[PDB]
Structure 1
């Protein structure tokens, strides 16, 4: 029965995810986690998308509690919003120059993969084939 007050509460969480403090963003993230697990399956996915926009920047963080509540928010948000949306958030930073960003994105993508590794089969991008390998999946584009 959060499908009712999700709208009332969003502009307060976006308010507190635009900084106020570490603990401010740690706590707004916990709230996002539990909203997502409650509203699983009732269509209030536009609101959780909106709040993804604000939670995902905290991904580069260091404090244990803060980054941990962030990761929790992203597992909740993974079941509630689906694994396409989150694989798309996780696409570009898998192969980044840096190593702090490579490592956080591979941490996330690992947890997105463990749970729901089987949806992703229809969510992976199209990755062209160079000379001595084959990389396209022709299985999937047989016409019929």
Structure 2
């Protein structure tokens, strides 16, 4: 129920500079992503989708990043289904926010255009 409150409070203060409270509450909402009960699991996802539009896609990607390639499938698929929600809702804004992956032996992974200097 507290996650439902966060979802609805998050969307109300969108555009008003209340992001420090919301980011503080993200620190409490986020460990509940490994819950398995469906009611609790969909309230948490609703809270995160509300928070994406209030504190931005960049923060939400910064939370997911470390677990997208984690060794356990348990942590991984939960993390991947948060990532997909961020991707669907804000696919264009994430262009500026992806990390830098280095080149390996045969594939190049640096986005060299952004590295351009005028």
Instruction: Place the TM-score, normalised by the shorter chain, in its bin.
Output: over 0.9
Q: How far is the alpha carbon of 1:82 from its aligned partner?
A: 0.2
The Cα RMSD (Å) is: 0.4
* Residues 104-139 of structure 1, C-alpha deviations (whole Å, 9 max, x = no match): 000000000001100000000000001101100110
Distance of 1:131 and 1:29 partners within structure 2: 45
Long gaps (5+) in structure 1: 1-26
Match for residue 107 of structure 1? Answer: 81
Distance 1:70 1:141 in 2: 37
Which string of whole-angstrom CA distances, capped at 9 and with x for unpartnered residues, describes residues 68-94 of structure 1?
100000000000110000000000000
Runs of 4+ in 1 over 2 A off after TM superposition: none
Higher Cα radius of gyration: 1
3-state DSSP of counterpart to 1:68: helix
Return the structure number with greater relative CO, CA threshold 8 A, min gap 6: 2
TM-score normalized by the length of structure 2: 0.99
Aligned length in residues: 118
Shift of 1:97: 0.4
- SS of the equivalent of 1:90 reads helix
Q: Post-superposition shift, 1:66?
A: 0.3
Q: CA deviation at 1:95?
A: 0.2
Which digits, 9 at most, give the CA deviation of each residue in 1:37-86, with x for residues without a partner?
Answer: 00000000000000000000000011110011000000000001100000
Cα distance in 2 between the residues matched to 1:28 and 1:130: 44
- How far apart are the structure 2 equivalents of 1:132 and 1:74? 37
What is the CA–CA distance in structure 1 between the aligned matches of 2:95 and 2:84, rounded to whole Å? 15
Cα distance between partner residues in 1 of 2:104 and 2:6:
42
